[PDB]
Amino acid sequence: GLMQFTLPVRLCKEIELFHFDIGPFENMWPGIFVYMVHRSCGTSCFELEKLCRFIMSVKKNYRRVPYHNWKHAVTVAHCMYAILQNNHTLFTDLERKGLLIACLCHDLDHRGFSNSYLQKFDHPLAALYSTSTMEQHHFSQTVSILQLEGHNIFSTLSSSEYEQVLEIIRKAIIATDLALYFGNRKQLEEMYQTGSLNLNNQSHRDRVIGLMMTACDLCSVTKLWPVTKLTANDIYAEFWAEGDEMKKLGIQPIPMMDRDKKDEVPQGQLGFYNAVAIPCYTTLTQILPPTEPLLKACRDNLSQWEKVIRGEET
Ligand SMILES: Cn1ncc(C(=O)O)c1C(=O)Nc1ccn2cc(-c3ccccc3)nc2n1
Ligand SMILES: [Mg+2]
Ligand SMILES: [Zn+2]
């Protein structure tokens, strides 16, 4: 109760900033997450014995893959922390509770392959979940861990409150299926520009939370350039692994996943910032103005990719 987590001065200052990197020391990541929960939600939101148990069970069900790993999970949770701390009054006590948990859990038991590879491999999960295959699995995995002995971090919530937070977490996790982002953003774009957007409307909150979930999921493009550049090595390691597997199925993979076409990466990253990232952070800054640093940092990294193509960098 009166046991408060403290970080060293640099982490304690840097952690409030959107572009914060959680560093290479795994054993500090759980304490970084508990520190963020206590500050976002309160020191009384969760029982520390159950939280710590939940956090280590979630860790254990993240696989040792180049990108979609325990580190990604805590990085996406930190972005959400940054957004919630800069939009203090606009979110309920349940939403703060659920959105940090959702972010930690959003890629549970990820194997490093897209929903498409699962469908073409004819994976059992692709028979069980027709769309957002992995994301339905990540939620399933979350509920399993919440149903483990001494892992129910929402024990103090009522029947109705429990159902509401699990519904927040479910929509939040489904929303990280990028294929749904495009329509979600376009609809948010139209609602903001006509003035019909209303945060008292639940279906509108759902959409805004979904865009926050995309923004947190992509926050690798909103770090300082040295971190963005090095993260990209981890992303393409999975993509090219997936391409190799497509070639084993007898399918020529998209260039993005073809390691023979790695020379086309800088221009590929250019496309992704224009088609996905900039649009995403633009609409987010429109709806939630204090999230502007994410746009600025994204814009800065777009410019760094342009310099790579021009041959000013390697
Ligand atoms: C989902 N997600 N989350 C983070 C990131 C990220 O990249 O940081 C991504 C991601 O979708 N990236 C993309 C998207 C489209 N691409 C097309 C090429 C490309 C094409 C041709 C040749 C060489 C590369 N590379 C791409 N990378
Ligand atoms: Mg995912
Ligand atoms: Zn993710």
E-strand stretches of the chain: none
Is 137 annotated in a binding site? The answer is no
Measured from the alpha carbon of residue 177, the closest ligand is 2
Residue 66 has what DSSP assignment?
A: S
Is 120 a pocket residue for ligand 1 (Cβ < 6 Å)? Answer: no
Only one residue has tokens 């019909």, namely: 196
Chain centroid to Cα 273, Å, comes to 17
Measured in whole angstroms, the distance separating CA 289 from the mean position of its chain's CA atoms is 20
CA–CA distance, 132 with 80 (Å, rounded to integer) = 21
Query: In this structure, what token pair is assigned to residue 93?
Result: 């006590």
User: 219 CA distance to ligand 2 centroid (A)?
Assistant: 13
Q: What is the number of H-type helices and E-type strands within the chain?
A: 15, 0
Inter-CA distances, 287 with 90, 173, 207, 210, 249, Å: 11, 20, 11, 12, 43
Q: How far is the CA of 286 from the centre of ligand 1 (A)?
A: 25
CA distances from 190 to 75, 183, 195, 201 (A): 30, 11, 9, 15
CA-based angle 113:71:111, to the nearest 5?
20
The torsion angle over the Cα atoms of residues 151, 80, 171 and 254, rounded to 10 degrees, is -110
Centroid of ligand 2 to alpha carbon of 145 (angstroms): 18
For residue 205, the tally of other CB atoms under 10 A from its CB is: 18
**Polymer length of the chain:** 314
Give the separation between CA 169 and CA 274, rounded to whole angstroms.
29
**Of 127, 117, 130, which is closest to residue 248 (Cα–Cα)?**
117
Give the resolution in Å.
2.4
Q: Which DSSP string do the residues of 15-47 spell out, in sequence order?
A: TTSTT----S-GGGHHHHHHHHHHHHT-SSSS-
Rounded CA-CA distance 84/20 in Å is 15
**110 assigned to active site:** no
Q: What is the distance, to the nearest Å, from the Cα of residue 40 to the centroid of all Cα atoms in its chain?
A: 17
Q: Is 16 within 8 Å of 78 (Cβ atoms)? A: no
Q: How far apart (Å, rounded) are the C-alpha atoms in residues 145 and 134?
A: 17
Residue type, 253: P
Task: Report the distance separating Cα 33 and Cα 30, nearest Å.
Answer: 5
Residue with tokens 């294929």: 179
Q: Are the CB atoms for 169 and 102 separated by under 8 Å?
A: yes
First-to-last CA distance in the chain?
Answer: 51
Q: State whether the beta carbon of 261 lies less than 6 angstroms from ligand 1.
A: yes
The Cα–Cα gap between 154 and 98 comes to 10
The token duo for 195 is 């003035």
Q: Distance (Å, rounded) from C-alpha 213 to C-alpha 76? A: 8
Whole-angstrom Cα distance, residue 126 to residue 137?
10
Judge whether 36 and 84 are in contact, CB under 8 Å.
Answer: no
Q: Among candidates 246, 243, 228, which has minimal Cα distance to 300?
A: 228
Instruction: Give dist(CA 2, CA 11) in Å, integer.
Output: 21
Q: Is the dihedral of CA 73, 79, 82, 85 positive or negative?
A: negative
Q: Report the C-alpha gap between 58 and 269 in whole angstroms.
A: 31
Q: Is 109 annotated as a binding residue?
A: no
Ligand nearest 301 Cα, by number? Answer: 1
Q: Would you tell me how many other CB atoms lie within 10 Å of the CB of residue 124?
A: 9
As assigned by CATH, the class of the 28-310 domain is mainly alpha
CA distance 149 to 50: 9
- Is residue 141 marked as binding? no
Between CA 70 and CA 59 the distance in angstroms is 6
Q: Does ligand 1 lie within 6 Å of residue 258's CB atom?
A: no
Method underlying the structure = X-ray
Binding site membership of 42 for ligand 1 (Cβ less than 6 Å): no
Q: From the CA of 274, how far away is ligand 1's center (Å)?
A: 11
**CB hemisphere CA count around 43 (13 angstroms):** 6
Please report the sign of the dihedral spanned by the C-alpha atoms of residue 109, residue 111, residue 117, residue 123: negative
Residues 308 and 273: beta-carbon distance below 8 Å: no
Contact by Cβ (8 Å): 211, 295: no
